[PDB]
Design a protein around this nucleic acid. Structure first.
Ligand SMILES: [Zn+2]
Ligand SMILES: [Zn+2]
Lengths: 122, 123
DNA sequence: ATGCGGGCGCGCCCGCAT
DNA sequence: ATGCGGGCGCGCCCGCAT
């Protein structure tokens, strides 16, 4: 059942990462939201409507140094998912969170919002 | 750094059953674990450089949850790894039996595991 | 009913970029 | 000299051989 969800999210990718990298990052996030139906629904809504339909934060636990590893490569979780679904050429320090983003990376909370439509490019 | 001399003398006694990178990494890892265990580092050097003729006490490392130790991306049992490096280059998984005086043998399922290759026998 | 195995990531740490 | 990104290991996870 998560295969359908993963595939649907994968079709909205921009191609800034390898197929293996994007698949692994999407599967990892979906698994983290397994018992967070509201946040999984928010991600699907945000991604499949290309941000037109409003959504709440999609959060994952923050690691000791803030970085997330996917297929042997480390990076910030909000940059990883914003690079997958919105800016394929995205670099570090090119993101500013929106006013309504309660769990932004900049806020240095226990959890980090990875909703790509909760960030803006600079 | 003084540990270079120790890693070299222990490398001389390698049998060639593993790659240079694997042997170097495994020996460096063990030496680092014995950093504040002078008696156990001395026991290992004594055992290895005398080819087991000079008696030695147990050379122990902390046991991991599943017993396995990872070296250069490859997992295996710590007592089999070091027994393969200095004694039996063709050594496989359940080919080892500890000696009577081995107090921390793998087989005893204790907190610490003896990796002294001269504290085991082949079957 | 276990225990391999092997994939994979966070935490630790080294050695390399600055 | 030394802070920091990238390599690597133990723990977790899970399928399958034993
Ligand atoms: Zn948000
Ligand atoms: Zn022993």
């Amino acid at each position: 059942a998560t295969l359908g969800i993963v595939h649907t999210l994968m079709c909205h990718r921009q191609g800034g990462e390898s197929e293996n990298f994007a698949k692994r990052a999407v599967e990892s996030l979906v698994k983290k939201l397994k018992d967070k139906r509201d946040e999984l629904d928010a991600l699907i809504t945000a991604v499949t409507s290309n941000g037109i339909q409003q959504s709440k934060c999609v959060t994952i636990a923050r690691t000791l140094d803030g970085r997330l590893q996917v297929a042997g490569k480390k990076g910030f979780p909000h940059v990883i998912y914003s690079r997958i679904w919105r800016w394929p050429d995205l670099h570090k320090n090119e993101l500013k969170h929106i006013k309504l983003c309660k769990f932004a990376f900049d806020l240095k909370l226990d959890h980090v919002c990875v909703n790509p439509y909760h960030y803006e490019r600079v």
